[PDB]
Scaffold this active site. Structure first.
Site, PDB file in Angstrom:
ATOM      1  N   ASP A 142       0.807  -1.205   0.000  1.00  0.00           N
ATOM      2  CA  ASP A 142       0.000   0.000   0.000  1.00  0.00           C
ATOM      3  C   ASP A 142       0.841   1.255   0.000  1.00  0.00           C
ATOM      4  O   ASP A 142       0.829   2.007   0.962  1.00  0.00           O
ATOM      5  CB  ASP A 142      -0.943   0.028   1.191  1.00  0.00           C
ATOM      6  CG  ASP A 142      -1.975   1.122   1.081  1.00  0.00           C
ATOM      7  OD1 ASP A 142      -2.306   1.506  -0.050  1.00  0.00           O
ATOM      8  OD2 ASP A 142      -2.461   1.598   2.118  1.00  0.00           O
ATOM      9  N   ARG A 146      -0.105   9.336   0.527  1.00  0.00           N
ATOM     10  CA  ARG A 146      -0.758   9.370   1.825  1.00  0.00           C
ATOM     11  C   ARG A 146       0.029   8.607   2.878  1.00  0.00           C
ATOM     12  O   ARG A 146      -0.044   8.917   4.058  1.00  0.00           O
ATOM     13  CB  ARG A 146      -2.172   8.823   1.719  1.00  0.00           C
ATOM     14  CG  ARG A 146      -2.294   7.361   2.077  1.00  0.00           C
ATOM     15  CD  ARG A 146      -3.725   6.890   1.974  1.00  0.00           C
ATOM     16  NE  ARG A 146      -3.976   6.325   0.664  1.00  0.00           N
ATOM     17  CZ  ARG A 146      -3.955   5.030   0.397  1.00  0.00           C
ATOM     18  NH1 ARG A 146      -3.709   4.163   1.363  1.00  0.00           N
ATOM     19  NH2 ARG A 146      -4.188   4.603  -0.833  1.00  0.00           N
ATOM     20  N   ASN A 147       0.743   7.576   2.450  1.00  0.00           N
ATOM     21  CA  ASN A 147       1.510   6.734   3.356  1.00  0.00           C
ATOM     22  C   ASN A 147       2.970   7.121   3.521  1.00  0.00           C
ATOM     23  O   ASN A 147       3.746   6.393   4.108  1.00  0.00           O
ATOM     24  CB  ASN A 147       1.381   5.273   2.976  1.00  0.00           C
ATOM     25  CG  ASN A 147       0.031   4.719   3.318  1.00  0.00           C
ATOM     26  OD1 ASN A 147      -0.619   5.186   4.239  1.00  0.00           O
ATOM     27  ND2 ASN A 147      -0.404   3.727   2.568  1.00  0.00           N
ATOM     28  N   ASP A 160       2.720   3.038   7.313  1.00  0.00           N
ATOM     29  CA  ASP A 160       1.559   2.165   7.094  1.00  0.00           C
ATOM     30  C   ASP A 160       1.806   0.759   6.565  1.00  0.00           C
ATOM     31  O   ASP A 160       1.172   0.319   5.619  1.00  0.00           O
ATOM     32  CB  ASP A 160       0.543   2.859   6.203  1.00  0.00           C
ATOM     33  CG  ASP A 160      -0.746   3.152   6.916  1.00  0.00           C
ATOM     34  OD1 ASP A 160      -0.728   3.965   7.856  1.00  0.00           O
ATOM     35  OD2 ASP A 160      -1.780   2.579   6.529  1.00  0.00           O
TER      36      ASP A 160
HETATM   37  C1  LIG Z   1      -1.518  11.196   5.397  1.00  0.00           C
HETATM   38  C2  LIG Z   1      -2.902  11.470   5.949  1.00  0.00           C
HETATM   39  C3  LIG Z   1      -2.817  11.548   7.463  1.00  0.00           C
HETATM   40  O1  LIG Z   1      -3.394  12.430   8.079  1.00  0.00           O
HETATM   41  N1  LIG Z   1      -2.085  10.611   8.045  1.00  0.00           N
HETATM   42  C4  LIG Z   1      -1.989  10.669   9.365  1.00  0.00           C
HETATM   43  C5  LIG Z   1      -2.922  11.331  10.143  1.00  0.00           C
HETATM   44  C6  LIG Z   1      -2.773  11.358  11.524  1.00  0.00           C
HETATM   45  C7  LIG Z   1      -1.696  10.733  12.139  1.00  0.00           C
HETATM   46  C8  LIG Z   1      -0.777  10.073  11.349  1.00  0.00           C
HETATM   47  N2  LIG Z   1       0.291   9.449  11.814  1.00  0.00           N
HETATM   48  C9  LIG Z   1       0.306   8.119  11.846  1.00  0.00           C
HETATM   49  O2  LIG Z   1      -0.682   7.493  11.497  1.00  0.00           O
HETATM   50  C10 LIG Z   1       1.412   7.426  12.288  1.00  0.00           C
HETATM   51  C11 LIG Z   1       2.526   8.136  12.679  1.00  0.00           C
HETATM   52  C12 LIG Z   1       3.650   7.466  13.125  1.00  0.00           C
HETATM   53  C13 LIG Z   1       2.487   9.524  12.616  1.00  0.00           C
HETATM   54  C14 LIG Z   1       3.569  10.283  12.997  1.00  0.00           C
HETATM   55  N3  LIG Z   1       3.474  11.651  12.917  1.00  0.00           N
HETATM   56  C15 LIG Z   1       2.362  12.225  12.477  1.00  0.00           C
HETATM   57  N4  LIG Z   1       2.348  13.542  12.426  1.00  0.00           N
HETATM   58  C16 LIG Z   1       1.264  14.177  12.049  1.00  0.00           C
HETATM   59  C17 LIG Z   1       0.326  13.651  11.190  1.00  0.00           C
HETATM   60  C18 LIG Z   1      -0.768  14.439  10.861  1.00  0.00           C
HETATM   61  C19 LIG Z   1      -0.894  15.717  11.382  1.00  0.00           C
HETATM   62  N5  LIG Z   1      -1.942  16.476  11.083  1.00  0.00           N
HETATM   63  C20 LIG Z   1      -2.233  17.629  11.954  1.00  0.00           C
HETATM   64  C21 LIG Z   1      -2.989  18.705  11.239  1.00  0.00           C
HETATM   65  N6  LIG Z   1      -4.083  18.132  10.465  1.00  0.00           N
HETATM   66  C22 LIG Z   1      -4.833  19.229   9.856  1.00  0.00           C
HETATM   67  C23 LIG Z   1      -3.515  17.320   9.393  1.00  0.00           C
HETATM   68  C24 LIG Z   1      -2.806  16.116   9.952  1.00  0.00           C
HETATM   69  C25 LIG Z   1       0.057  16.234  12.236  1.00  0.00           C
HETATM   70  C26 LIG Z   1       1.132  15.448  12.555  1.00  0.00           C
HETATM   71  O3  LIG Z   1       2.111  15.870  13.376  1.00  0.00           O
HETATM   72  C27 LIG Z   1       1.948  17.244  13.676  1.00  0.00           C
HETATM   73  N7  LIG Z   1       1.314  11.498  12.103  1.00  0.00           N
HETATM   74  C28 LIG Z   1       1.353  10.167  12.171  1.00  0.00           C
HETATM   75  C29 LIG Z   1      -0.927  10.048   9.981  1.00  0.00           C
END
Ligand SMILES: */C=C/C(=O)Nc1cccc(-n2c(=O)cc(C)c3cnc(Nc4ccc(N5CCN(C)CC5)cc4OC)nc32)c1
Length: 305
Positions: A142, A146-147, A160
């Site tokens: 996948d 997005r990933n 992912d």
């Molecule tokens: C790619 C789409 C998406 O949003 N993916 C997503 C959303 C939420 C959280 C994560 N995500 C993980 O699933 C796994 C890990 C390890 C991870 C690590 N760091 C982050 N950072 C991160 C993701 C998403 C955001 N935002 C905040 C603002 N919002 C409007 C959009 C999404 C913020 C953020 O760190 C500030 N996310 C992770 C993946």
């Protein structure tokens, strides 16, 4: 036939880390922005904590645990790292925080400010992580924009792996035809997904085959239709995508080759991508959810004996 997997899985006390904010929610679980202090050592690690909201469902946990198993077993700069697992009422995954979020969100949001050098560089980094997966023999199954997650605007990481599987043993638009028709996944099938991913970045977050039925998609590929050349894209960059989408999997380029090609291009970026005002653009205290700590270290700098 196979080497023993001698990766360490670390179990963490709930007290060790704190949840600051909710990054995302829904389905089985929600993932939180967080701070982790490890045991005796005095360091603070920014983490993403993902836990199952719907209590425990016995069927559900296998997916979360599998993700942990795969994540622990990988060490690469361009692949996301799992710090720890917390065995609470709900299984919790503590992972390195990618501060800048989703790569897909990032290109869409910053399309006006994203230069060719960044784009070519991101392409190189994804290929490097994916090649590392190939060395492992793990298959992402996948891969999409997005990933991919961005730790700094100059450093992205593949993510992912929950559905990830060993070689041997839905995102229809990203999928290879061999995967659509026969449910067959290989590193090469992964390469095709890599091409769609590259296309997403080139198009600054546009949606592939927009307004097309997935049912439609196999025929179109069978038809020999493919994604259009992006406006920023030169023929050399576009051709690489096209090779990725070839029906014969062996014909498709290897990730190791892809690293080589994109790097050559990265050496002289303006030649391969033409973007308006390329020369001008610039891309990025500084810590959130806490005021107190300058003891913060990135997960990457935090290593385990
Ligand atoms: C790619 C789409 C998406 O949003 N993916 C997503 C959303 C939420 C959280 C994560 N995500 C993980 O699933 C796994 C890990 C390890 C991870 C690590 N760091 C982050 N950072 C991160 C993701 C998403 C955001 N935002 C905040 C603002 N919002 C409007 C959009 C999404 C913020 C953020 O760190 C500030 N996310 C992770 C993946």
């Amino acid at each position: 036939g196979e080497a023993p997997n001698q990766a360490l899985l670390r179990i963490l006390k709930e007290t060790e880390f704190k949840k600051i904010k909710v990054l995302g929610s829904g389905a089985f679980g929600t993932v939180y922005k967080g701070l982790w202090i490890p045991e005796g050592e005095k360091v603070k690690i920014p983490v993403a904590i993902k836990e199952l909201r719907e209590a425990t469902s016995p069927k559900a946990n296998k997916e979360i645990l599998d993700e942990a198993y795969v994540m622990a077993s990988v060490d690469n700069p361009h692949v996301c790292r799992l710090l720890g697992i917390c065995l609470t009422s709900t299984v919790q995954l503590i992972m390195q925080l990618m501060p800048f979020g989703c790569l897909l969100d990032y290109v869409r949001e910053h399309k006006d400010n994203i230069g060719s050098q960044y784009l070519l560089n991101w392409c190189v980094q994804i290929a490097k992580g994916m090649n590392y997966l190939e060395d492992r023999r793990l298959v992402h199954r996948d891969l999409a924009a997005r990933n991919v997650l961005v730790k700094t605007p100059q450093h992205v990481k593949i993510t992912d792996f929950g559905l990830a599987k060993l070689l041997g043993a839905v995102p229809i638009k990203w999928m290879a035809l061999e995967s659509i028709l026969h449910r067959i996944y290989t590193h090469q099938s992964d390469v095709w997904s890599y091409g769609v991913t590259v296309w997403e970045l080139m198009t600054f977050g546009s949606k592939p085959y927009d307004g097309i039925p997935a049912s439609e998609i196999s025929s179109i590929l069978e038809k020999g239709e493919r994604l259009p050349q992006p406006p920023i894209c030169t023929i050399d960059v576009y051709m690489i995508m096209v090779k990725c989408w070839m029906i014969d999997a062996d014909s498709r380029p290897k990730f190791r080759e892809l690293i080589i090609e994109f790097s050559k291009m990265a050496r002289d970026p303006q030649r391969y991508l033409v973007i308006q005002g390329d020369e001008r653009m610039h891309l990025p205290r500084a810590l959130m959810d806490e005021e107190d700590m300058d003891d913060v270290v990135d997960a990457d700098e935090y290593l385990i004996p």
